[PDB]
Amino acid sequence: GAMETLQEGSEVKGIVKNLTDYGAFVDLGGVDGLLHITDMAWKRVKHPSEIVNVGDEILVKVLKFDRDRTRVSLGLKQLGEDPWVAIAKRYPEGHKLSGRVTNLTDYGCFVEIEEGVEGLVHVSEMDWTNKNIHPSKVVNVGDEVEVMVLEIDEERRRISLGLKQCKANPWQS
């Protein structure tokens, strides 16, 4: 059960016998496969020990291969379906969703939609008064709020939301 008959996209279990700061190494039973840290999950994994430890037998998917057959690339997120690929069918543009500001910038506010999904609201569509108003005047990190889908880039892995879509119209009293 190794490079012997394995081919990209195949699913095989291996033993994580080594953990580096850029990835890890799995034993396919006579050959080591490099699992890049960024392939341990859909999120931003910082260390492989977070997801898997030495001497553990997990089910990885072959992503790539070395020059001819020798070494291989493994993954630990392709074993499931990424939430962003279906994000378009879950909640496309126009859908109302409740997020929470996790980060604040000078050009907008970042809002986490869910575990692994984080969108961004531009200063232009977060208030009605200005276009470049500081997002701190509108919201703060930790404030749970509602937003509407404006643009999702599943490829660039970045999401766009609108806050004003959940705000009150000034021409009403």
Side-chain angles (χ1 to χ4, degrees):
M3 51 175 175
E4 51 183 41
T5 51
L6 263 52
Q7 60 202 216
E8 276 173 58
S10 186
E11 285 164 7
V12 295
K13 304 197 76 191
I15 286 284
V16 182
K17 34 64 61 157
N18 194 222
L19 301 171
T20 61
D21 291 299
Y22 61 84
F25 291 85
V26 159
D27 190 355
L28 316 178
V31 49
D32 291 81
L34 181 282
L35 330 75
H36 196 327
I37 270 176
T38 183
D39 291 283
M40 294 300 186
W42 312 295
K43 62 138 173 185
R44 180 69 69 182
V45 176
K46 298 77 64 60
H47 201 241
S49 186
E50 308 184 271
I51 285 49
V52 65
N53 295 153
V54 173
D56 189 22
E57 188 197 85
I58 74 303
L59 173 58
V60 297
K61 175 169 286 177
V62 45
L63 309 183
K64 325 291 173 68
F65 257 102
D66 204 272
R67 52 195 290 237
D68 179 269
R69 193 69 60 122
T70 171
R71 311 184 297 193
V72 82
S73 191
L74 311 310
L76 262 169
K77 75 248 192 66
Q78 324 68 29
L79 291 297
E81 191 178 286
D82 188 292
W84 284 55
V85 306
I87 206 167
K89 65 168 294 181
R90 293 176 169 202
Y91 46 98
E93 295 169 55
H95 183 98
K96 171 69 71 59
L97 51 152
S98 57
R100 170 153 57 150
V101 184
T102 66
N103 288 100
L104 203 71
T105 75
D106 300 293
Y107 59 87
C109 68
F110 280 87
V111 69
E112 179 174 66
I113 309 180
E114 46 169 294
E115 302 173 278
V117 182
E118 179 203 82
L120 165 62
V121 185
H122 197 236
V123 288
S124 58
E125 295 190 75
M126 69 190 309
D127 78 302
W128 56 262
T129 58
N130 200 328
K131 178 181 67 180
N132 300 328
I133 186 174
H134 205 247
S136 185
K137 320 303 294 177
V138 182
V139 283
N140 188 269
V141 175
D143 188 44
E144 198 177 61
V145 283
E146 299 175 73
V147 286
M148 179 162 295
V149 186
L150 298 183
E151 182 69 284
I152 291 202
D153 292 84
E154 310 82 349
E155 178 65 79
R156 312 301 303 177
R157 307 203 75 204
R158 183 51 55 191
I159 292 173
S160 285
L161 295 309
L163 196 178
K164 66 178 183 180
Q165 303 299 331
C166 312
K167 183 165 291 181
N169 172 30
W171 300 92
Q172 87 187 30
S173 302

Short mmCIF file of all heavy atoms in Angstrom, two decimals, residues 104-142:
data_model
loop_
_atom_site.label_atom_id
_atom_site.label_comp_id
_atom_site.label_asym_id
_atom_site.label_seq_id
_atom_site.Cartn_x
_atom_site.Cartn_y
_atom_site.Cartn_z
N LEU A 104 -10.25 43.77 12.94
CA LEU A 104 -10.60 45.10 12.49
C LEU A 104 -9.42 45.71 11.78
O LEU A 104 -8.27 45.53 12.21
CB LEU A 104 -11.00 45.95 13.69
CG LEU A 104 -11.88 47.15 13.40
CD1 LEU A 104 -13.28 46.69 13.01
CD2 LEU A 104 -11.93 48.09 14.59
N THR A 105 -9.67 46.39 10.68
CA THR A 105 -8.61 47.02 9.91
C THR A 105 -8.95 48.49 9.73
O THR A 105 -9.80 49.02 10.45
CB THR A 105 -8.46 46.37 8.52
OG1 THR A 105 -9.52 46.79 7.66
CG2 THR A 105 -8.51 44.86 8.63
N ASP A 106 -8.24 49.17 8.85
CA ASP A 106 -8.53 50.56 8.54
C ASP A 106 -9.31 50.65 7.23
O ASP A 106 -9.77 51.72 6.85
CB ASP A 106 -7.24 51.38 8.43
CG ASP A 106 -6.44 51.37 9.72
OD1 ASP A 106 -6.91 51.94 10.72
OD2 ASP A 106 -5.34 50.79 9.73
N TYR A 107 -9.48 49.51 6.56
CA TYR A 107 -10.15 49.46 5.27
C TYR A 107 -11.37 48.54 5.31
O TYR A 107 -11.93 48.17 4.27
CB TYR A 107 -9.17 48.99 4.18
CG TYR A 107 -8.57 47.62 4.44
CD1 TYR A 107 -9.22 46.46 4.03
CD2 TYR A 107 -7.36 47.48 5.11
CE1 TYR A 107 -8.69 45.21 4.27
CE2 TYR A 107 -6.81 46.24 5.35
CZ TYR A 107 -7.48 45.10 4.93
OH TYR A 107 -6.94 43.86 5.18
N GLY A 108 -11.85 48.25 6.51
CA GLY A 108 -12.98 47.35 6.64
C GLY A 108 -12.89 46.49 7.88
O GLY A 108 -11.94 46.60 8.66
N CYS A 109 -13.87 45.62 8.06
CA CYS A 109 -13.88 44.73 9.21
C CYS A 109 -14.09 43.29 8.77
O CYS A 109 -14.92 42.99 7.91
CB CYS A 109 -14.98 45.14 10.20
SG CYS A 109 -16.66 44.90 9.58
N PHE A 110 -13.33 42.40 9.39
CA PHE A 110 -13.40 40.98 9.10
C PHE A 110 -14.44 40.31 9.97
O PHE A 110 -14.44 40.48 11.18
CB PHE A 110 -12.03 40.34 9.32
CG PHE A 110 -11.09 40.54 8.18
CD1 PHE A 110 -10.29 41.66 8.10
CD2 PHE A 110 -10.99 39.58 7.19
CE1 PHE A 110 -9.42 41.84 7.04
CE2 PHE A 110 -10.12 39.75 6.13
CZ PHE A 110 -9.34 40.88 6.05
N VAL A 111 -15.32 39.54 9.34
CA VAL A 111 -16.41 38.90 10.06
C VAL A 111 -16.40 37.38 9.81
O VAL A 111 -16.41 36.92 8.67
CB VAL A 111 -17.77 39.53 9.64
CG1 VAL A 111 -18.14 39.19 8.21
CG2 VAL A 111 -18.88 39.11 10.59
N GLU A 112 -16.32 36.61 10.89
CA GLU A 112 -16.32 35.15 10.77
C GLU A 112 -17.75 34.65 10.66
O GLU A 112 -18.60 34.95 11.50
CB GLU A 112 -15.60 34.50 11.95
CG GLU A 112 -15.57 32.97 11.91
CD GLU A 112 -14.71 32.38 13.02
OE1 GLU A 112 -15.08 32.52 14.21
OE2 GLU A 112 -13.67 31.76 12.70
N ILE A 113 -18.01 33.96 9.57
CA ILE A 113 -19.34 33.44 9.28
C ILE A 113 -19.57 32.12 10.00
O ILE A 113 -20.65 31.85 10.53
CB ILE A 113 -19.50 33.23 7.77
CG1 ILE A 113 -19.10 34.52 7.04
CG2 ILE A 113 -20.92 32.79 7.43
CD1 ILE A 113 -19.20 34.48 5.53
N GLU A 114 -18.50 31.35 10.09
CA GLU A 114 -18.53 30.03 10.69
C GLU A 114 -17.13 29.45 10.79
O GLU A 114 -16.16 30.06 10.34
CB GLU A 114 -19.44 29.07 9.90
CG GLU A 114 -19.23 29.12 8.39
CD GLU A 114 -19.94 28.00 7.65
OE1 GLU A 114 -19.57 26.82 7.84
OE2 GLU A 114 -20.88 28.29 6.88
N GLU A 115 -17.04 28.25 11.34
CA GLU A 115 -15.76 27.57 11.53
C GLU A 115 -15.08 27.30 10.20
O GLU A 115 -15.43 26.35 9.49
CB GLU A 115 -15.98 26.25 12.28
CG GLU A 115 -16.65 26.42 13.63
CD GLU A 115 -17.00 25.09 14.27
OE1 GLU A 115 -18.05 24.53 13.91
OE2 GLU A 115 -16.23 24.62 15.12
N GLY A 116 -14.12 28.15 9.85
CA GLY A 116 -13.39 27.98 8.61
C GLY A 116 -13.80 28.99 7.55
O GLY A 116 -13.14 29.11 6.52
N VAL A 117 -14.89 29.71 7.80
CA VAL A 117 -15.37 30.71 6.86
C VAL A 117 -15.33 32.10 7.48
O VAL A 117 -16.04 32.38 8.45
CB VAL A 117 -16.79 30.41 6.38
CG1 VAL A 117 -17.23 31.44 5.37
CG2 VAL A 117 -16.89 29.02 5.78
N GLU A 118 -14.52 32.96 6.90
CA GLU A 118 -14.35 34.32 7.36
C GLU A 118 -14.48 35.27 6.18
O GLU A 118 -13.78 35.14 5.17
CB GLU A 118 -12.98 34.50 8.00
CG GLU A 118 -12.70 35.91 8.50
CD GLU A 118 -11.21 36.18 8.60
OE1 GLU A 118 -10.60 36.51 7.56
OE2 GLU A 118 -10.65 36.01 9.70
N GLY A 119 -15.40 36.21 6.29
CA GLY A 119 -15.60 37.19 5.25
C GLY A 119 -15.09 38.56 5.64
O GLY A 119 -14.60 38.75 6.76
N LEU A 120 -15.22 39.52 4.74
CA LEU A 120 -14.76 40.88 4.99
C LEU A 120 -15.77 41.91 4.49
O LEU A 120 -16.37 41.74 3.43
CB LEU A 120 -13.39 41.10 4.32
CG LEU A 120 -12.91 42.55 4.17
CD1 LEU A 120 -12.74 43.23 5.52
CD2 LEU A 120 -11.61 42.60 3.39
N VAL A 121 -16.00 42.92 5.31
CA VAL A 121 -16.90 44.01 4.95
C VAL A 121 -16.08 45.26 4.68
O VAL A 121 -15.29 45.69 5.52
CB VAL A 121 -17.93 44.31 6.06
CG1 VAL A 121 -18.93 45.35 5.60
CG2 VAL A 121 -18.65 43.04 6.49
N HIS A 122 -16.26 45.84 3.50
CA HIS A 122 -15.50 47.03 3.13
C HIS A 122 -16.10 48.26 3.79
O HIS A 122 -17.31 48.34 3.96
CB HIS A 122 -15.51 47.20 1.60
CG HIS A 122 -14.44 48.12 1.08
ND1 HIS A 122 -14.70 49.22 0.30
CD2 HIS A 122 -13.09 48.08 1.23
CE1 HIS A 122 -13.57 49.82 -0.01
NE2 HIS A 122 -12.58 49.15 0.55
N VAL A 123 -15.24 49.20 4.17
CA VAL A 123 -15.67 50.45 4.80
C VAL A 123 -16.75 51.18 4.01
O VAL A 123 -17.57 51.90 4.58
CB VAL A 123 -14.47 51.41 5.02
CG1 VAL A 123 -13.58 50.91 6.13
CG2 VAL A 123 -13.67 51.59 3.74
N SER A 124 -16.82 50.91 2.72
CA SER A 124 -17.76 51.58 1.84
C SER A 124 -19.19 51.09 2.03
O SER A 124 -20.14 51.84 1.82
CB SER A 124 -17.33 51.36 0.40
OG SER A 124 -17.26 49.97 0.09
N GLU A 125 -19.35 49.81 2.35
CA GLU A 125 -20.68 49.25 2.50
C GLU A 125 -20.95 48.81 3.93
O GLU A 125 -21.80 47.94 4.16
CB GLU A 125 -20.89 48.09 1.53
CG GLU A 125 -20.86 48.54 0.08
CD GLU A 125 -21.30 47.46 -0.89
OE1 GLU A 125 -22.52 47.18 -0.96
OE2 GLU A 125 -20.44 46.91 -1.59
N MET A 126 -20.25 49.39 4.89
CA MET A 126 -20.51 49.05 6.28
C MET A 126 -21.34 50.13 6.98
O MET A 126 -22.04 49.85 7.96
CB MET A 126 -19.23 48.69 7.05
CG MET A 126 -18.26 49.83 7.32
SD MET A 126 -16.67 49.23 7.95
CE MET A 126 -17.19 48.18 9.30
N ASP A 127 -21.31 51.36 6.46
CA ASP A 127 -22.14 52.43 6.99
C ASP A 127 -22.80 53.18 5.83
O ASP A 127 -22.53 52.86 4.67
CB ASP A 127 -21.32 53.42 7.81
CG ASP A 127 -20.54 54.36 6.93
OD1 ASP A 127 -19.74 53.88 6.12
OD2 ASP A 127 -20.76 55.58 7.04
N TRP A 128 -23.75 54.06 6.12
CA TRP A 128 -24.39 54.86 5.08
C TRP A 128 -23.86 56.30 5.04
O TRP A 128 -24.06 57.01 4.06
CB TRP A 128 -25.92 54.86 5.22
CG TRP A 128 -26.43 55.34 6.56
CD1 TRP A 128 -26.80 54.55 7.61
CD2 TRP A 128 -26.64 56.70 6.98
NE1 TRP A 128 -27.21 55.33 8.66
CE2 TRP A 128 -27.12 56.65 8.31
CE3 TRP A 128 -26.47 57.95 6.38
CZ2 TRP A 128 -27.43 57.80 9.03
CZ3 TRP A 128 -26.78 59.09 7.10
CH2 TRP A 128 -27.25 59.00 8.41
N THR A 129 -23.23 56.75 6.13
CA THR A 129 -22.76 58.13 6.23
C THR A 129 -21.54 58.44 5.37
O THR A 129 -21.51 59.46 4.69
CB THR A 129 -22.46 58.52 7.70
OG1 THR A 129 -21.47 57.66 8.28
CG2 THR A 129 -23.71 58.49 8.55
N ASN A 130 -20.55 57.57 5.40
CA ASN A 130 -19.31 57.81 4.68
C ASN A 130 -19.01 56.61 3.78
O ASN A 130 -19.84 55.72 3.62
CB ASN A 130 -18.18 58.03 5.70
CG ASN A 130 -16.94 58.75 5.17
OD1 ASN A 130 -16.55 58.64 4.01
ND2 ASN A 130 -16.30 59.51 6.04
N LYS A 131 -17.87 56.66 3.12
CA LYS A 131 -17.42 55.58 2.26
C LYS A 131 -16.11 55.01 2.79
O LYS A 131 -15.76 53.86 2.53
CB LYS A 131 -17.24 56.09 0.83
CG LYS A 131 -16.71 55.04 -0.14
CD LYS A 131 -16.53 55.59 -1.55
CE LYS A 131 -15.42 56.64 -1.61
NZ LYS A 131 -15.25 57.18 -2.99
N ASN A 132 -15.37 55.84 3.53
CA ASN A 132 -14.07 55.44 4.05
C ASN A 132 -14.00 55.61 5.56
O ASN A 132 -12.92 55.79 6.12
CB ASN A 132 -12.96 56.28 3.39
CG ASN A 132 -12.91 56.12 1.88
OD1 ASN A 132 -13.22 55.06 1.34
ND2 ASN A 132 -12.52 57.18 1.19
N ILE A 133 -15.17 55.62 6.21
CA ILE A 133 -15.23 55.76 7.66
C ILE A 133 -14.47 54.62 8.33
O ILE A 133 -14.41 53.51 7.81
CB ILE A 133 -16.70 55.76 8.16
CG1 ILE A 133 -16.77 56.06 9.66
CG2 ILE A 133 -17.38 54.43 7.84
CD1 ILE A 133 -18.18 56.22 10.19
N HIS A 134 -13.81 54.90 9.45
CA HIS A 134 -13.08 53.87 10.16
C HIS A 134 -14.06 52.81 10.66
O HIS A 134 -15.07 53.14 11.26
CB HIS A 134 -12.31 54.48 11.34
CG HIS A 134 -11.11 53.68 11.73
ND1 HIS A 134 -10.99 53.02 12.93
CD2 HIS A 134 -9.98 53.44 11.05
CE1 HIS A 134 -9.83 52.38 12.96
NE2 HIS A 134 -9.20 52.63 11.83
N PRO A 135 -13.78 51.52 10.44
CA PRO A 135 -14.69 50.45 10.83
C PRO A 135 -14.93 50.39 12.34
O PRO A 135 -15.91 49.80 12.79
CB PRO A 135 -14.00 49.17 10.34
CG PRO A 135 -12.58 49.55 10.17
CD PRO A 135 -12.57 51.00 9.78
N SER A 136 -14.06 51.04 13.11
CA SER A 136 -14.20 51.05 14.57
C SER A 136 -15.36 51.95 14.98
O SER A 136 -15.88 51.83 16.09
CB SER A 136 -12.91 51.53 15.23
OG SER A 136 -12.98 51.44 16.64
N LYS A 137 -15.75 52.85 14.09
CA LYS A 137 -16.85 53.76 14.37
C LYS A 137 -18.17 53.02 14.15
O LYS A 137 -19.23 53.45 14.61
CB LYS A 137 -16.80 54.98 13.44
CG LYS A 137 -15.39 55.54 13.18
CD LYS A 137 -14.64 55.92 14.44
CE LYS A 137 -15.30 57.10 15.15
NZ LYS A 137 -14.62 57.44 16.43
N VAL A 138 -18.07 51.91 13.44
CA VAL A 138 -19.23 51.11 13.08
C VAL A 138 -19.36 49.87 13.96
O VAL A 138 -20.43 49.60 14.51
CB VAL A 138 -19.14 50.69 11.59
CG1 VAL A 138 -20.36 49.88 11.16
CG2 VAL A 138 -18.98 51.91 10.70
N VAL A 139 -18.26 49.13 14.10
CA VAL A 139 -18.24 47.90 14.90
C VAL A 139 -16.91 47.73 15.60
O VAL A 139 -16.01 48.55 15.47
CB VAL A 139 -18.51 46.63 14.06
CG1 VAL A 139 -19.98 46.49 13.72
CG2 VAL A 139 -17.67 46.64 12.79
N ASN A 140 -16.79 46.65 16.37
CA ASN A 140 -15.56 46.33 17.06
C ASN A 140 -15.37 44.82 17.07
O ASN A 140 -16.33 44.07 16.88
CB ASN A 140 -15.61 46.89 18.49
CG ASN A 140 -14.29 46.77 19.22
OD1 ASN A 140 -14.02 45.78 19.89
ND2 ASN A 140 -13.45 47.78 19.08
N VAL A 141 -14.14 44.38 17.28
CA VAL A 141 -13.84 42.96 17.30
C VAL A 141 -14.52 42.30 18.50
O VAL A 141 -14.36 42.75 19.64
CB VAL A 141 -12.33 42.67 17.35
CG1 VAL A 141 -12.05 41.18 17.51
CG2 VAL A 141 -11.65 43.21 16.11
N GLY A 142 -15.33 41.29 18.23
CA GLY A 142 -16.04 40.60 19.27
C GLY A 142 -17.51 40.88 19.22
O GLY A 142 -18.31 40.19 19.84
#
